[PDB]
RNA sequence: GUGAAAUUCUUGGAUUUAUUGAAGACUAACUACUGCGAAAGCAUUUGCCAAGGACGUUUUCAUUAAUCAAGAACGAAAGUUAGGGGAUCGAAGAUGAUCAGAUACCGUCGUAGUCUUAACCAUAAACUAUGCCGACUAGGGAUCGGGUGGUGUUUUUUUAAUGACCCACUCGGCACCUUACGAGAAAUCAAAGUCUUUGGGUUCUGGGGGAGUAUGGUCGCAAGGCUAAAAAAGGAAUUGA
RNA sequence: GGAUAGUGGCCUACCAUGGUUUCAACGGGUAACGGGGAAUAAGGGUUCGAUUCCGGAGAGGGAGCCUGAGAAACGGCUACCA
């Protein structure tokens, strides 16, 4: 027998930066200024709805 | 040299580098964009209101089994039906049809000998009053 | 000419022999765990043109440096455009034999290409599968280039070169052999090491396989628009009844 | 020069072509009022701060003014929109 090792070639897409920029707009840019405040108001508002 | 710069005037390069890689972290992105409550079991809320469609497993024989405890409710902000546990076949008598239950999570730590997988919600209140109060006979279910 | 034959071309004598002539490629053996170059790459001779490493130097300027997006140069082979010749080999293609076995699946001819000029294209298992600069940390011999010293043999002597081998030291290479008081998952590593948890300078980058599923997240691709058919022992059989 | 209580492209003339930025200008997002402060971990940091004090802004939303030492006041007035 022969045991020819095979090789990995390259990647296609696993990067968080391009996963962000892959939209037509910038998901990094469209953000908020107080994420904890947003989280607790989202909790309370969902409960009231 | 561990890749990073170390000079005493390099705080600008250090800060911008850390900003980019913070954005590339996973949970930071969810927390800043507001999608953790889009990954939550039924959206952001703690409990979730529903309409009782049918009491499943009524035609089972052996009492107090999990397929007898189960119901099928449809959540009202989605029109989406899903099952729900109800402890105590007495409380199954309390929930009948067109009832507006308030489901919550299940939050089990271990399974049981006859449990159904994937039934992740339980019933907390029915028609405005609590199932435990109705079971303990503190209150009365108002039609 | 294959494993086997057959298309093919041979009395206007093929294959072969001799004497040549032309053509375009190519540069065998000599060929090395040798050399040069930033890499891809580079082998006939001689001449010209510039360039470069290393050595040697009681020469010279005196921080002129290191790492670095943008951009630039170069980038094997194939490939494109427009010219050149076109011997050899030859994706496509045309054919012969389709013979059991593929153990031992080809043969003949040949377009493009191969080669060369001018422009594009800019990719490879383009590999020491390992950012760069600096420093330190084991021994052993080699081999190439330069230099210093000594010792002889080969050498030659008022002629134009005084080189070759030996040994010791020495820089600078291509590498190799033993091992680590080190590192590690282990193979292994003189770096993938620099005393338990960490600072010599600096650019880039990150937060396994198949499967099953949903897609508004997206790019692409379709067809036809006169046209039709209605149960069998009523067996088998040189083997039967 | 006008205007203002007063400086000032604040505004009007006439003039020069300047000003900011890879040390990130400009423009975008902000469930952005700023601060004293609140929570947490060993340090470093990170997250909250509409909310007893301080400052700014607003009175359904554009705009405008009267009185007055003090207001572009809204428990003052005028016109528009809702």
Swiss-Prot record, chain A:
Residues 1-38 are annotated as: Disordered. Residues 1-22 have a biased composition (Basic residues). It is found in: Cytoplasm; Nucleus, Nucleolus. GTPase required for synthesis of 40S ribosomal subunits and for processing the 35S pre-rRNA at sites A0, A1, and A2. Controls access of pre-ribosomal RNA intermediates to RCL1 during ribosome biogenesis by binding of RCL1 in a GTP-dependent manner and, via its affinity to U3 snoRNA, delivering it to pre-ribosomes. GTP-binding and/or GTP hydrolysis may induce conformational rearrangements within the BMS1-RCL1 complex allowing the interaction of RCL1 with its RNA substrate. Required for RCL1 import into the nucleus. Belongs to the TRAFAC class translation factor GTPase superfamily. Bms1-like GTPase family. BMS1 subfamily. Interacts directly with RCL1 and the U3 snoRNA to form a stable subcomplex. Component of the 90S small subunit processome also known as 90S pre-ribosome that consists of the 35S pre-rRNA, early-associating ribosomal proteins most of which are part of the small ribosomal subunit, the U3 snoRNA and associated proteins. This is Ribosome biogenesis protein BMS1. It comes from Saccharomyces cerevisiae (strain ATCC 204508 / S288c) (Baker's yeast). The lineage of its organism: Eukaryota, Fungi, Dikarya, Ascomycota, Saccharomycotina. The gene is BMS1. The chain holds residues 2 to 50 of 1183 of the full protein.
UniProtKB/Swiss-Prot annotation, chain B:
There is a cross-link at residue 55 (Glycyl lysine isopeptide (Lys-Gly) (interchain with G-Cter in ubiquitin)). Keywords: Cytoplasm, Hydroxylation, Isopeptide bond, Ribonucleoprotein, Ribosomal protein, Ubl conjugation. One of its GO terms (biological process) is maturation of SSU-rRNA from tricistronic rRNA transcript (SSU-rRNA, 5.8S rRNA, LSU-rRNA). Hydroxylation at Pro-63 affects translation termination efficiency. The stereochemistry of the 3,4-dihydroxyproline has not yet been determined. GO terms for molecular function: structural constituent of ribosome. It comes from the Eukaryota. Disulfide bonds: none annotated. Changing residue 64 to A: Lethal mutation. Its main location: cytoplasm. Pfam families: Ribosom_S12_S23. Signal peptide: none annotated. Present with 10600 molecules/cell in log phase SD medium. There are 2 genes for uS12 in yeast. Component of the small ribosomal subunit (SSU). Mature yeast ribosomes consist of a small (40S) and a large (60S) subunit. The 40S small subunit contains 1 molecule of ribosomal RNA (18S rRNA) and 33 different proteins (encoded by 57 genes). The large 60S subunit contains 3 rRNA molecules (25S, 5.8S and 5S rRNA) and 46 different proteins (encoded by 81 genes). Belongs to the universal ribosomal protein uS12 family. Component of the ribosome, a large ribonucleoprotein complex responsible for the synthesis of proteins in the cell. The small ribosomal subunit (SSU) binds messenger RNAs (mRNAs) and translates the encoded message by selecting cognate aminoacyl-transfer RNA (tRNA) molecules. The large subunit (LSU) contains the ribosomal catalytic site termed the peptidyl transferase center (PTC), which catalyzes the formation of peptide bonds, thereby polymerizing the amino acids delivered by tRNAs into a polypeptide chain. NCBIfam families: PRK04211.1 (NF003254), uS12_E_A (TIGR00982). This is Small ribosomal subunit protein uS12A. It comes from Saccharomyces cerevisiae (strain ATCC 204508 / S288c). The lineage of its organism: Eukaryota, Fungi, Dikarya, Ascomycota, Saccharomycotina.
């Amino acid at each position: 027998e022969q045991s020819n090792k095979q090789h990995r070639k390259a990647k296609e897409k696993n990067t968080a930066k391009k996963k962000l920029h892959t939209q037509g707009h910038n998901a990094k840019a469209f953000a908020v200024a107080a994420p904890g405040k947003m989280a607790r108001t989202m909790q309370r508002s969902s409960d009231v709805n | 040299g561990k890749g990073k710069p170390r000079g005493l005037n390099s705080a600008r390069k250090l800060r911008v580098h850390r900003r980019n890689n913070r954005w590339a972290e996973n949970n930071y992105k969810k927390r800043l964009l507001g999608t953790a409550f889009k990954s939550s079991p039924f959206g952001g809320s703690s409990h979730a209101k529903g309409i009782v469609l049918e009491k499943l497993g009524i035609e089972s024989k052996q009492p107090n089994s999990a397929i007898r405890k189960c119901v099928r409710v449809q959540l009202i902000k989605n029109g989406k039906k899903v099952t729900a546990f109800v402890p105590n076949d007495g409380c199954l008598n309390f929930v009948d049809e067109n009832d507006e239950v308030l489901l919550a999570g299940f939050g089990r730590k271990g399974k049981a000998k006859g449990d159904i997988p994937g039934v992740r919600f339980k019933v907390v209140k029915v028609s405005g009053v609590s199932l435990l109060a109705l079971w303990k006979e503190k209150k009365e279910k108002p039609r």
